[PDB]
Amino acid sequence: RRGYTYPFGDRGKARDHLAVLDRTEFDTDVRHDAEIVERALVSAVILAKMSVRETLVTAIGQTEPIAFVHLKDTEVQRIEENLEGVR
Amino acid sequence: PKDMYLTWEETRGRLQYVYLIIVYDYDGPETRPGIYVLTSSIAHWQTLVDVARGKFARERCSFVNRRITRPRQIPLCTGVIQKLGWCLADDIHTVVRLDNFSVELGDFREFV
Amino acid sequence: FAATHNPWASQAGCLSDVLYNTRHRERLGYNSKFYSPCAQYFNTEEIIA
Amino acid sequence: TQNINTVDMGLGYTSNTCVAYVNRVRTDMGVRVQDLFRVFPMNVYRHDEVDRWIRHAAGVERPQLLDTETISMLTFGSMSERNAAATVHGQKAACELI
Amino acid sequence: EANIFCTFDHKLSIADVGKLTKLVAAVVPIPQRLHLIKHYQLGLHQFVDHTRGYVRLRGLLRNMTLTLMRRVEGNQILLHVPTHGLLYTVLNTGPVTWEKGDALCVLPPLFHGPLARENLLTLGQWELVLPWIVPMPLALEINQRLLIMGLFSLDRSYEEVKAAVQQLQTITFRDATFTIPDPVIDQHLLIDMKTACLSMSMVANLASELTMTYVRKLALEDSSMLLVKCQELLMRLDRERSVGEPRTPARPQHVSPDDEIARLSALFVMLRQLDDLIREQVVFTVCDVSPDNKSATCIFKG
Amino acid sequence: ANIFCTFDHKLSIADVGKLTKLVAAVVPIPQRLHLIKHYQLGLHQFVDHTRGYVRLRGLLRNMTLTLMRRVEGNQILLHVPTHGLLYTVLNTGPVTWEKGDALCVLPPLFHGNLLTLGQWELVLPWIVPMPLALEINQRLLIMGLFSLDRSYEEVKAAVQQLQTITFRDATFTIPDPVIDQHLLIDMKTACLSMSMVANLASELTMTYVRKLALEDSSMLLVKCQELLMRLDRERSVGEPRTPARPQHVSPDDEIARLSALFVMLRQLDDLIREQVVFTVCDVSPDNKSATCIFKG
């Protein structure tokens, strides 16, 4: 809903990724959850990258890395410390 | 035919125009279309449609009821008027049939 | 014996040859009723044919 | 109906024609330039407020309300001048070139 | 049957027969379709009754059959009912500009504005008022403005409806201006509003998930004049509803085009049903007009 | 009534042999004038790149049709048909006829044997049965609605499915309304108008059933209001709480809504309706001409 209300540069490329974001539904098993969250996450981060108009990589057959957006680097270190403690 | 004939009149108009009218009553599960032959003194199409709407509002509410009770099935229409011609008030004969009949094969004009 | 006295008008591709060319006004949906008096020197299909 | 027809029997140009004598000037010979905002009526700026400001500062009026003659003005080429009240100088005529 | 004779009751002066003989090839509405009639059944003055409703005259005038006036000889005028498809001629008494290639309708007499009260026929307590033979776009505009004045005026105080109706009654058609005299709320007008409301709701239901968002798609895409002039209306609508932003449309999920064809077919049915309530039938289609706009000929019945 | 259509050009006798094959065809004329030139003949007076389809169907409503009767060497006797009497016309369009079919008239977009002069060409409208006419009319209109999003491919498969047309001995290629990723202008106004009418139909009945049920309120209004509630509930189900319509509206915005609804409904009559012209009678063998009654 925050993606539909937000004005981007172009709307079709944001639109099909928002449509990918609308297809985030889960089953009772968790084997498919851990693979559908990566497509939900790459769609969310490319909305995050196109919403601020930052240059995303566009190599042939290239994937966007799952990265936090617009944070302080000590906050990045603290949140990765927490996620490693989860690991 | 005495069954299909009907009117809303004292039939004392001089020039009795005739009208084929069918409806679509959806109180049945599929459809119960009441086919009707209708004479009338009135000749203009639109005001006749308004009088018929005043007379057949039960089929209209049945039509909207079909629309709410089944969204995937499309409701086709509600009814279709088509005039055939006109006669005189003494040309009727009680099966009611007509001795003279001017013809006018009009168009299928739908209405809701 | 010059090249061109108005480089914004002559070559096919300037503003006036897409503002006053009738065959270029149809790509922009112009009001047909007006008589543009400049539209007699700027066509090509009326001119070169 | 008389269905006449004619054959030229000239080797070259027999008939001539001279512009001989002038009575009057039907146009204005004025400076009222050809206004673009009727001859290209549909085109507007993408930002709304700046286009409102430009049509305010140029005198040319926007469509006030959406009626059928305005739609026919946009789709067809129509009579979009809505001609002047007094007409003491005949027609009006100019154009533009940069 | 094609010819009917109307006889007058009063004696006729030279002024009476002189006023009548200028009315050759004019329109006369007759209700009764009887072979012989008195002059009380002539024209429209038997049903002209103000403070009753213009829609009443528009309703009953729609049912009355027409004729032309020719062979006036005193105490008889010999009206001739035209039949379908033949070529007849018509003189317009109403001051309406006529153009060729145009289709005509019959409306009750709405006054020109000076209120000339040119009855153009003199009796002691009878007048010959005439319906206006009017081109189709003006009559369509009359029915449209009539229905707008009908729908708007419900549950309104006199102030806002006065300040709107004083704008809405004024019409313009080819350097002329007319008004609607008796626009009151009547029963036939009310049932036409209910049918229009049912039809509009059926258009609301029978729209797919892509025809609803096409104007949103073009509002993202293009910027013409009418794009802005429609986007302001839809934007004011969605802003009066929600104080959020009007969302960008999405990708079409379920495409299965037979549903869209049947959907547009039902939309077409309901939209023709809505459109017939403002469109009247063509009662005359012209062939050529006089350059004085005093008469013309027409290939249709009455 | 007779119309005499002459040619100012030179007429080759080979073109007379071409023209006498058009012994009786439908041609439209902009105004019933007794003596006329050939520049008003046909549909070549309206052809361009930008107008396209809906302009011709709008200009065909007010044109009067006529039939060629005989051929003189430099004038053609055109004969305006009158209602009720019957004439023999020729099947110009690609569809073949059957008995009893109501014939409608349509501008020939696909058309591709015509009279040829230096600047003037002859083009004749398709005389199609009415159900096929409505069928390709709604096909072209849905194909115009889909015109903005063809960057995706299942919608490309959809418009490819909508491209062909099923009829008796008929696989036509209806031309694409969107050209070079842009729509022609009158179809753009048409699809925009039906889009905004579909929008205001949603956004005004929620007020007007309330405004109208303060009178006698039958069950029609009740089921209409429940259907409107179903539309609202299925509309805003993926949305925040509700649209939350207000009651105290400004009058003039409501006037500008309703007048716009009706005035854009006004410019869709050419697409929702069909001029029936001929009701056909007994057809010739091999179906290249037919005696038909002019129901106009």
Short mmCIF file of C-alpha atoms in Angstrom, two decimals, chain F residues 11 17 29 35 54 60 62 70 100 105 107 117 134 138 154 158 176 203 213 216 227 236 240 253 265 267 270 284 293:
data_model
loop_
_atom_site.label_atom_id
_atom_site.label_comp_id
_atom_site.label_asym_id
_atom_site.label_seq_id
_atom_site.Cartn_x
_atom_site.Cartn_y
_atom_site.Cartn_z
CA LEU F 11 -12.26 8.71 -67.77
CA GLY F 17 -15.30 -1.38 -67.40
CA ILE F 29 -23.03 11.55 -49.80
CA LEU F 35 -25.90 17.93 -59.16
CA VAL F 54 -14.71 6.52 -34.74
CA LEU F 60 -21.66 8.16 -41.26
CA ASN F 62 -25.47 12.11 -40.64
CA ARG F 70 -26.78 3.43 -64.35
CA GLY F 100 -33.22 -12.51 -43.27
CA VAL F 105 -22.90 -0.34 -42.63
CA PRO F 107 -16.20 1.93 -42.60
CA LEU F 117 -7.68 8.82 -60.25
CA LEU F 134 -21.74 -5.28 -33.04
CA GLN F 138 -17.00 -4.36 -29.18
CA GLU F 154 -0.33 -12.72 -21.83
CA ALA F 158 -5.17 -11.81 -25.40
CA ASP F 176 -4.44 -2.54 -34.51
CA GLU F 203 -19.03 7.15 -7.29
CA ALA F 213 -35.24 6.42 -1.37
CA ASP F 216 -41.58 5.50 -1.97
CA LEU F 227 -25.57 -4.54 -4.64
CA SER F 236 -12.03 -1.61 -0.87
CA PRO F 240 -7.68 0.88 4.14
CA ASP F 253 -19.26 20.04 -7.75
CA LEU F 265 -22.46 9.50 -22.17
CA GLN F 267 -20.48 10.85 -27.14
CA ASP F 270 -22.29 6.01 -32.12
CA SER F 284 -28.66 -14.20 -55.95
CA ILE F 293 -35.67 -3.70 -48.44
#
